[PDB]
């Protein structure tokens, strides 16, 4: 069956781990390390291949923000370097439309990006596209009906409840209804045609609440909260259920993986990562 892949993350420095969780049997498998350690990255999957995008290597030797894009083939257990983005993007959000990867926002040093670029795997090229209305790092990104969504995050000064949507054929961003909750560093994913925003940080506390956006009602509605409040969590969808992995809560790095069942509106803790960590990239194939 399909596996949940978690790549990189942070705990006393940025990590190189790639591990795969099998939700059907509860097992974790250690796979080939990232070639360069990274935290604050994002994962996504195009054509059965796993991509690690952006992040930074924050080590005791000093920090380097990453413009890198790397590709893992699960059939071969080999990582291959791809063309880098035009700029480093730490705490990036990514979404995939028509087999192309959009890189959204993130930071390079003190710069909080509003910019956005699009990678075509068949050509190995990145192209810049229109920038967001707002600079957003720690931004949640999801794709619904071939429109790209940038949700919450941090603009350099304020944590945001705002969200905006990009229409590729118009190459245009517009603001949509804002979330009920200010969230920076939430996990954002699409499940059953609704955009979910789980957790995050509001400038004072980590959040365990979770709300979802419906394009049809233009409304954000709360669902059951997670058991553990968290920000800088990885989030993904595996056979119609949401998983959140790790994060930070002001006191600890979480190893907790929680699972949301939309058919019962309930969370459970289904496994723990082999060590607590924040800022992972995660995807399913």
């Amino acid at each position: 069956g399909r596996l949940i892949y978690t790549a990189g993350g942070y705990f006393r420095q940025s990590l190189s781990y790639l591990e795969a969780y099998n939700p059907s049997d509860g097992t974790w498998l250690r796979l080939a390390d990232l070639q360069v350690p990274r935290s604050g990255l994002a994962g996504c999957v195009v054509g059965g291949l796993l991509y690690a995008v952006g992040g930074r290597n924050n080590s005791p030797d000093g920090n380097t923000d990453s413009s890198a894009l790397d590709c893992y083939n699960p059939m071969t257990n080999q990582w291959s370097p791809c063309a880098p983005m035009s700029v480093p993007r730490n705490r990036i959000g990514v979404g995939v439309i028509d087999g192309h990867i959009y890189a959204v926002g993130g930071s390079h040093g003190c710069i909080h990006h509003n910019s956005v670029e699009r990678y075509e795997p068949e050509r190995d090229e990145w192209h810049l596209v229109a920038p967001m209305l707002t600079r957003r790092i720690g931004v949640g990104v999801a794709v619904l009906n071939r429109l790209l969504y940038a949700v919450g995050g941090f603009d350099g000064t304020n944590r945001l409840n705002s969200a905006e949507c990009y229409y590729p054929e118009r190459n245009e961003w517009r603001m949509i209804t804002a979330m009920n909750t200010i969230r920076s560093g939430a996990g954002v994913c699409v499940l059953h045609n609704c955009i979910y925003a789980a957790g995050g940080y509001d400038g004072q506390d980590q959040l365990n609440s979770v709300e979802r956006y419906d394009v049809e009602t233009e409304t954000w509605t709360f669902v059951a909260p997670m058991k553990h409040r968290r920000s800088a969590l990885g989030i993904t969808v595996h056979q119609g259920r949401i998983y959140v992995l790790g994060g930070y809560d002001g006191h600890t790095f979480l190893d907790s993986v929680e699972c949301y069942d939309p058919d019962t509106d309930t969370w459970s803790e289904v496994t723990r990562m082999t060590s607590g960590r924040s800022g992972v990239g995660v995807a399913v194939t």
Binding site: Y10, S39, G40, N58, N63, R91, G138, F154, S184, G185, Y201, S231, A232, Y248, G250, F253, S278, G279
Partner: peptide, 16 residues
């Protein structure tokens, strides 16, 4: 240039 102490990122827990 001053070998400043690291600061805590309240969101991610990283020290920079």
């Amino acid at each position: 240039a001053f070998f400043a102490q690291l600061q805590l990122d309240e969101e991610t827990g990283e020290f920079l």
